[PDB]
Amino acid sequence: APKKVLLALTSYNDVFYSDGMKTGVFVVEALHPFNTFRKEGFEVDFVSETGKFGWDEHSLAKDFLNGQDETDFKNKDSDFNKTLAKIKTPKEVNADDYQIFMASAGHGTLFDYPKAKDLQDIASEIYANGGVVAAVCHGPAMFDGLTDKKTGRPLIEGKSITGFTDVGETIMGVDSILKAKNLATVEDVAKKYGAKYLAPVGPWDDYSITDGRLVTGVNPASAHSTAVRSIDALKN
Amino acid sequence: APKKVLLALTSYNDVFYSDGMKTGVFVVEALHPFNTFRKEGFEVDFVSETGKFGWDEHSLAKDFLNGQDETDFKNKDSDFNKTLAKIKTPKEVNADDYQIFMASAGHGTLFDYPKAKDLQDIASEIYANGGVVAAVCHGPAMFDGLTDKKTGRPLIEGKSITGFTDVGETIMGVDSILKAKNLATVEDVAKKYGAKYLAPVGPWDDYSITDGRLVTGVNPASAHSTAVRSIDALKN
């Protein structure tokens, strides 16, 4: 019985940082989970609102992309790249074929995830069928408006989750940018929908939480842990 | 509430393991928090149900006690040992003089913490005063019967905590002992008092949670982080 994971990527790719660089998909937030799922025998399908995506340019730096990751990123024939090439649009997805819905991030998610009704329906269906919903970094942005098909309440209401920290936005000096673009942080979303936000000791620590079948991670360093947790949570 | 910490130690110190070794206070669960508090400018008072304690013999092994820790442990003139010499009984404690109540562990806590009503009242008072209640490893055994003075409900009811894992007990082969001695695991306590137990990915990982002013850690590897968390939590 083929075990499948639907890995969502932000479709937003545009100038964002003060240095003029663009945000978009944080490379390892897509690559590490991909590797973890593949290692465990899962098949992985990528998807974005538009079927297209761009890389967060800061995530391309050597500190965030090196060694085997860089090699896989550069090799056109890598499993990673060949799979990315087959990226789907929400309309091409059949929710019932997946056991796990994983939302990778990068600041780009703040632009499209909150309004991605079709991806939210897919995540909601996967969750209603006993599957797992997981998200790392700014991925929880997609929880804004995500409803639990069985209860009708926000899927994260009364749940414990983590995600990119407010302090992290401040340390990066992007908090003023978020305010200017009328974007909400992960902690903002958690507060709005009645979720309990639990923070890491430090903003860049590998930190993740498993609350039943809802799994969340804080940042790039938490991508792998988030993926591992989503696999383990299938028995929850 | 002066910058002072009350660090609780288990008073149980009897043969426990299959090899005949005794359990008791897990050295680094007392030492690491002690160093962290002292480093941040806090005065620290030790306390145990009987005013006495013994070391968990497995925690004395090189893998758990080495380097500077071993040096401080052996140095009879260390600030650690001089403070341990002044260990108090619950009756010699004034709850109003502490900002933080910290429960260190080792398997010994499973024997005395659940019935340590006097220490629980102290913890409850500190918490009611706006202070922090923290526990690491089996320390959450202290939460069995702990009441929130403001509501009359279990202090951990509706709260998210972590602590030593059931799987960890099985791996160590101590589950058979717990069953024989009619002891409850941390996860058992969490369920009995309405708390949400959030688990680490692996039983030995450095993992901790901050839920307002209630802080918890999973094991020896998490003692330092739990102490760090208890200090940062003083603003909740």
Swiss-Prot record, chains A, B:
Per the record, its GO cellular-component terms are: cytoplasm; cytoplasmic stress granule; P-body
**Residues annotated as the enzyme's active site:** 137-138, 169
Domain of life from the UniProt record = Eukaryota
Any one GO biological process: chaperone-mediated protein folding
What is the recorded post-translational modification?
Answer: Cys-137 is easily oxidized to sulfinic acid.
One GO MF term on file is: glyoxalase III activity
Q: Which Pfam families match?
A: DJ-1_PfpI
Give the reactions, separated by semicolons, that this protein catalyses.
methylglyoxal + H2O = (R)-lactate + H(+)
Q: Which UniProt keywords apply?
A: Cytoplasm, Lyase, Oxidation, Stress response
Q: Where in the cell is it found?
A: Cytoplasm, P-body
Q: Which InterPro entries does UniProt cross-reference here?
A: Class_I_gatase-like (IPR029062), DJ-1/PfpI (IPR002818), Prot/Nucl_acid_deglycase (IPR050325)
Q: Which residues carry this modification: Cysteine sulfinic acid (-SO2H)?
A: 137
Cystine residue pairs = none
Following inactivation of the gene, the phenotype reported is: Results in higher sensitivity to oxidative stress, reduced thermotolerance, accumulation of higher levels of reactive oxygen species, and reduced chronological life span.
Major subcellular site: cytoplasm
Give the E.C. number(s): 4.2.1.130
Induction is noted as: Up-regulated 10- to 30-fold during entry into stationary phase, by hydrogen peroxide or diamide stress, by heat stress, and by growth in the presence of the proline analog azetidine-2-carboxylic acid.
Query: What function does the entry list?
Result: Catalyzes the conversion of methylglyoxal (MG) to D-lactate in a single glutathione (GSH)-independent step. May play a role in detoxifying endogenously produced glyoxals. Involved in protection against reactive oxygen species (ROS). Important for viability in stationary phase. May negatively regulate TORC1 in response to nutrient limitation.
Family label: Belongs to the peptidase C56 family. HSP31-like subfamily.
Q: How does it assemble?
A: Homodimer.
Additional detail: No protease activity could be detected.
Instruction: From the Swiss-Prot or TrEMBL record, give the protein name.
Output: Glutathione-independent glyoxalase HSP31
Q: What is the lineage of its organism?
A: Eukaryota, Fungi, Dikarya, Ascomycota, Saccharomycotina
Query: Encoded by which gene?
Result: HSP31
